[PDB]
Amino acid sequence: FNLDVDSPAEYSGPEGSYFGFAVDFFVPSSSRMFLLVGAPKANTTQPGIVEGGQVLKCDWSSTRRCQPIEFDATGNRDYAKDDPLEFKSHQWFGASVRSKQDKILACAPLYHWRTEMKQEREPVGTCFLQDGTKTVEYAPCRSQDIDADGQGFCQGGFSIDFTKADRVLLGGPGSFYWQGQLISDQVAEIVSKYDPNVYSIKYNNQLATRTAQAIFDDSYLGYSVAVGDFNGDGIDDFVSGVPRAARTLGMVYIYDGKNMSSLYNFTGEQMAAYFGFSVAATDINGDDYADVFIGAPLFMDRGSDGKLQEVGQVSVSLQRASGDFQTTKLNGFEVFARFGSAIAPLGDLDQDGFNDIAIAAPYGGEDKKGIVYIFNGRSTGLNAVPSQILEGQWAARSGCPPSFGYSMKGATDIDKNGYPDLIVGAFGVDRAILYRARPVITVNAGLEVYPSILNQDNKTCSLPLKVSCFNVRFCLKADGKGVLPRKLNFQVELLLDKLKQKGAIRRALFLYSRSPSHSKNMTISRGGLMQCEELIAYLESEFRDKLTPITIFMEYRLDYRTAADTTGLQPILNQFTPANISRQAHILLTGG
């Protein structure tokens, strides 16, 4: 709920380059931070290559300049005279990007090579890894096991990720007649074992899935990947979606990160819903147990009228110490919006103590501009009601819809205000947007009325004649996590006896003001105890109705403009905190 939407940082790339198809944060090990954006169809300087694609590094401060990252300036290598070895044209480089401190890994899943035995064009896929200075190539699917029977069409790099222990996890959905394949290699070995003259490099401590029976053909293992511990060993385990497995019913395999031994299987529920298009792993209930989020963008729900409505669905499986999962589902909202296309952990967005998450509907909203919903984690799991809705601000430039939300990455505090932020890509319009998290303020308000029971014949106070009177006292304190100003300015507006509308008479007014209203600018220090202020208010010949109670209502609103920082990011108030409170008073009736 605390994402700045009035002034997010907007970045753009070359028209038609699909700028924003994949986004990520680049945070070197006490150094400036940058955005990373993939442009898979971008033309390049490397000679004789059309739409080779690239990966842009976008500055954080000052101008929003995006400069490409030079992973490889060379054209297609020849294996023999007029016998090209590879085909980088339309290889879709930058379609998959992941960063980890000094390491940046990009991949071209439509890269082709001829093979060393015959003249073919097989999409083995390739990647380029860059640390501090070195820049190596990583093609674990271009090998001797060629053609569809092996890794010929593996498209290695279709999806990637890092593990906590600097280990690359790569998915190749086309291995072994599209049974898919997962490959895990230590970064140190991808670096050390690199050789410019060997095209099928062998890595010692490699982990990879083994070809299986034909029943598993056309299952697309590795379509999407994610990492997280799911056996209590500390080693990040591998998670991958298999959207065509189980007779196009979809599945999600979880393998041990230590030796690629099968750990768990999730199975879809509806055929062709593409259960397993997107996958994410994060502890959403603060139990320190990684939870699994699985997307099915094509899911159809049957509501009241029986009509099936394609709205998509996301399964939230909370891990328990026992081993199994407590699974709860979450349908979309708009038809054909493909809710669940992208799933991005955000960290503790509101810094409430439970991680949060964003789920995309890239083809929803007015004119299919695309939407991103935000959900907050709770002790009980995920709050199924989204606390924020982000909408694209561009229309169909050409053919492909904006696709705002198709890609997005969070959980990084780029401005260093104590809260993670979010990047959202919209490749159909060649844009990427950085939404920054506003610091959350928690406010405690107090209101006391003494005496609560009024006495019309009391007449203690002396109006500047005498009238019966009482005291109205409002207190206020506030504090919050992260970076915020030391003095917070709230304006409090008090009104007396609201239940009687303006058209009707009022009975309780203030002494010094002679008015029912009272406004006050109040500068309270942040994190201190309650600053309080009380004032006197007085009250038969002017009204007959005494049976209706007297409500004393107070609302408070902080001054955003003065509380903003130098970058302009204004603080925000906690989402579940009433902006107003009230007390009551009554008159003694006859009695005795």
Partner: protein, 333 residues
């Protein structure tokens, strides 16, 4: 409450205006004009099936003309999207094959049947790599391209898709770099799906919507084990049925007629678009089922109505379609 005049709809009443329990009478006619469109996968595995159907449609027209007053027949072929990794993109690439292709509408519905025979034998076979075949794009195109294929607004519009393996899905396209969802509109310039390499396959939701809107009843004629695949998808596409082409084949005519008499033997209702509706069944025999599950075995003569209970909670017009039919009932603190 109020019933419109001059009827002229097969579902009675044809238009209603209620402002907040009534019964609507659907009744299928016996002799229905029929529009049969053979959409066939022409991949390698189908060489036997194509050869078989060279002169079998000529026979079926006998039974069908006996079943239906009018009868017309059209034909179209499909394979897969002509882009890697679905096909081999070597400038060459073993027996007599034609180049791959998304979808070609070759013959519009016509009564002259020998034209269909001449068109099918003239058909040749292609080939690709991945086992599943992009059939759903062809289905959508044959559905929405009403004028090109020539679907009559009166005839029962049957689309017979003939294959042997599973069909491709929309998100499958992402592998090829095709990430622009299907737009669901006709894109045939010279009877060729020009958008085969630019848009994803249509999702089942889009396809169901386009079939229901164009009132197309699909018949999945398949051979291999994947029959069960197309069978388990039936609940997701109403007004659709599947038939297994048994090993030896040649049951094509008998299969499609067994499938035809099964939709005349079923009248199911589906409402589109804040208000809840509750439905009960009134079959010839005493049966009481929810509207989504329409009676079966329904004899063409017997009347069949449904109860509707309308209960609005918050203080437009809705449409109640009996699937497979072309005429409908519009209904308007």
């Amino acid at each position: 409450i109020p019933t419109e005049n001059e009827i002229n709809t097969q579902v009675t009443p044809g238009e209603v205006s209620i402002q907040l329990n009534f019964m609507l009478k659907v009744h299928p006619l016996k002799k229905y004009p029929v529009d049969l469109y053979y959409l066939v996968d022409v991949s390698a595995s189908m060489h036997n099936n194509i050869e078989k159907l060279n002169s079998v449609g000529n026979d079926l027209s006998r039974k069908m003309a006996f079943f239906s007053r009018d009868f017309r027949l059209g034909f179209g072929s499909y394979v897969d999207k002509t882009v890697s990794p679905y096909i081999s993109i070597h400038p060459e690439r073993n027996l007599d094959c034609m180049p791959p292709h998304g979808y070609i509408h070759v013959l519009s519905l016509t009564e002259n049947i020998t034209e269909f025979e001449k068109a099918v034998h003239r058909q040749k076979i292609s080939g690709n790599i991945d086992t599943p075949e992009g059939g759903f794009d062809a289905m959508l195109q044959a559905a929405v391209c009403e004028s090109h294929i020539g679907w009559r607004k009166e005839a029962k519009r049957l689309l017979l898709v003939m294959t042997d393996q599973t069909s491709h899905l929309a998100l499958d396209s992402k592998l090829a770099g095709i990430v622009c969802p299907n737009d669901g509109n006709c894109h045939l310039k010279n009877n060729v799906y020009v958008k085969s390499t630019t848009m994803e396959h249509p999702s089942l939701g889009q396809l169901s919507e386009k079939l229901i809107d164009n009132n197309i009843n699909v018949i999945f004629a398949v051979q291999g084990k994947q029959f069960h695949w197309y069978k388990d998808l039936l609940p997701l596409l109403p007004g659709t049925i599947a038939g297994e082409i048994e090993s030896k084949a040649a049951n094509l005519n008998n299969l499609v007629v067994e499938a035809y008499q099964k939709l005349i033997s079923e009248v199911k209702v589906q409402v589109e678009n804040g208000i809840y509706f509750n439905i009960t069944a009134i079959c010839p025999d005493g049966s009481r089922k929810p509207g989504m599950e329409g009676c079966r075995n329904v004899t063409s003569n017997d009347e069949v109505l449904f109860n509707v209970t309308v209960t609005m909670k918050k203080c437009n017009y809705a449409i109640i379609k009996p699937i497979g039919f072309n005429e409908t009932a519009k209904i308007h603190c």
